[PDB]
Amino acid sequence: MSPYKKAIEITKRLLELLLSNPELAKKNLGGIATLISLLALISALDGTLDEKDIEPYIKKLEESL
Amino acid sequence: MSPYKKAIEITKRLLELLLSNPELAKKNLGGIATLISLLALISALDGTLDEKDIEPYIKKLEESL
Amino acid sequence: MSPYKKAIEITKRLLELLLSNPELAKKNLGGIATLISLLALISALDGTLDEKDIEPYIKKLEESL
Amino acid sequence: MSPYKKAIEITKRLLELLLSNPELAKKNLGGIATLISLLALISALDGTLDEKDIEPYIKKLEESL
């Protein structure tokens, strides 16, 4: 478990928490977006960035607009 | 191709989402700001930071106050 | 001494500020989450990420919903 | 102007914008805190983290609670 891999898992857990309730998601759009950016940054630091792993979250965010 | 370049494109996509609607942008100013900071950080990690690539977003933020 | 260690201490201070008041924490869930992600990122940059150092904050976040 | 130094200046500009109006600051506490964390992280990446440069912002945030 590389440190970056642990940080990815944590950030994905945080995204699921904030998106779990759409009413809570719509009041925290900026934070969800910032988490998605952080997930990409950490992934690129780990050298395992795959766009397919990020797009589901972007599409969920878009639906919550 | 670079993983940082993919993360830059994702972060700009997220900024466009949050700025698309002036009313949603005024409700998420801190999130837009944190995304502009991240865009700058990721750009510096990628070696390529041109201020001219950030400033448009900063002026858009200033517009929403 | 390490600059990353100072940034870890600052980020934990900010998390304690935002969590001190349950009412302010429920209004800033996305910010608490993004700080927990950053704490993990910075820890991974410093080489030292122990999940046990992050989990208390995650459970506190889950408490505020 | 090293890329990290440009990112520091941008992040400090963003902090001043969000803190410029206390009424706007109190609605964006989480984003201000996340910006302060990012300022520390970027500073440590540049190898120029001085706690004295960060504390003024933390004290302003505390006053806005």
Author numbering:
A (entry chain B), B (entry chain A), C (entry chain A), D (entry chain B): 4 to 68
What does the primary publication say about this deposited structure?
To evaluate design accuracy we attempted crystallization of 19 designs and succeeded in solving crystal structures for seven (three C2s, two C3s and two C4s). All crystal structures had the correct oligomerization state and closely matched the design models (median Cα RMSD of 0.6 Å across all designs, with resolutions ranging from 1.8 to 3.4 Å). The side chain conformations in the crystal structures also closely match those of the design models. HALC4_136 is composed of 3-helix protomers with eight outer helices encasing four almost fully hydrophobic inner helices, where two of the helices are rigidly linked through a 90° helical kink. The closest match in the PDB has a TM-score of 0.71, but the matched structure has C5 symmetry rather than the C4 symmetry of the design and crystal structure.
